[PDB]
Amino acid sequence: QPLDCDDIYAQGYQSDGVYLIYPSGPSVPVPVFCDMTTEGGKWTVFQKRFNGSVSFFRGWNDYKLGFGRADGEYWLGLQNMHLLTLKQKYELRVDLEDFENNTAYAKYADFSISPNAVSAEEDGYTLFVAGFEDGGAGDSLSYHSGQKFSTFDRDQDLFVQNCAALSSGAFWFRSCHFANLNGFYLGGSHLSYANGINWAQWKGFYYSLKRTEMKIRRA
């Protein structure tokens, strides 16, 4: 059984598409989309957005189990992500695109959800990212490292207010985000503050991207 998608590369499949991996165990699979093309491939994608159809302003439960279609926009589920990061060391890549036909990305050498936590729930699925290699976009996620995942159901952020509610999304919020890749799909520039799909360092807080996907690969 392949638990990640780098295993699937070894299985003998290299066309990027929907695939079944067994992160828990052989009992139940979960379908994911894999980017076998970008930078040698072997990417497991836990986050996809482009159409704007699927709303990512969901509750803590949907974000734990995952939600959406492996074909189009989806969120793999925080629990699944924890099972992968728990048993193997992983690398992060996020790939972004605006409405001006420009692409950008940012890479982080290490990436883990609640690393070395006896229970991910108790630890709030903390996000950890280490060494950052710069692509097109800047470094927004390093600001978020060490923060529990927050939703309008469960406020874990360091802000007196509910930053997840104010930002129209879910993320590992601090005082408030520099990256809200689950914000509301406002499709271009917006006059509201830091509530759309925003990567602060690339296009600021008042610009909502067109496409967004966060990729994961073995060490």
**Site residues, a copy of itself (CB under 8 A):** 18, 20, 24-32, 52, 55, 57-59, 62, 65-71, 74-77, 80, 83, 86-87, 116-119, 121-123, 126, 146-148, 152, 155-156, 158-160, 162, 165-166, 168, 184-192, 195, 208
Residue among 8 and 107 whose Cβ is closer to a copy of itself: 8
Nearest distance, CB of residue 65 and a copy of itself, angstroms = 5
Alpha carbon separation from 89 to 12, 32, 106 (Å, rounded)? 22, 19, 18
Cβ at position 102, least distance to a copy of itself in Å: 18
Residue at token pair 């469960």: 154
Give the 3-state DSSP-derived string for 127-154, with helices as H, strands as E and coil as C.
Answer: EEECCEEECCCCCCHHHCCCCCCECCCC
Pick one of 135, 159, 165, 192: the residue that binds Ca ion (CB under 5 A): 159
* Least distance CB 77 / a copy of itself (angstroms): 6
CB of 178 to a copy of itself, least distance (A): 16
Q: Note every long-range contact of 62-65, with CB atoms under 8 Å and residues 24 or more positions apart, other chains counting.
A: 63/149, 63/151, 63/170, 64/125
Q: What is the C-alpha separation between 160 and 50, in angstroms, rounded?
A: 32
Map residue 164 onto helix, strand or coil.
helix
Could you tell which of a copy of itself, Ca ion, none binds residue 189, using a CB distance below 5 to 8 A set by kind? a copy of itself
Binding of residue 157 to Ca ion (CB under 5 A): yes
Within 10 Å of residue 202's Cβ, how many Cβ atoms? 20
| Closer residue to a copy of itself (CB): 107 or 210 | 210
For Ca ion, what does the binding mask look like between residues 110 and 149, x meaning CB under 5 A? ----------------------------------------
- Label residue 122 exposed, middle or buried (CB < 10 Å: 0-12, 13-18, 19+): exposed
Q: Which residues pair with 97 in a beta bridge?
A: 103, 211
Q: What is the C-alpha separation between 136 and 95, in angstroms, rounded? A: 9
Instruction: CB nearer to a copy of itself: give 32 or 106.
Output: 32
Q: Is 155 in the site for Ca ion (CB under 5 A)?
A: yes
Residue 70 binding partner per list a copy of itself, Ca ion, none, with a CB distance cut-off of 5 to 8 Å that depends on partner kind: a copy of itself
Q: Which residues pair with 214 in a beta bridge?
A: 94
Binding positions for Ca ion, rule: CB under 5 A: 155, 157, 159
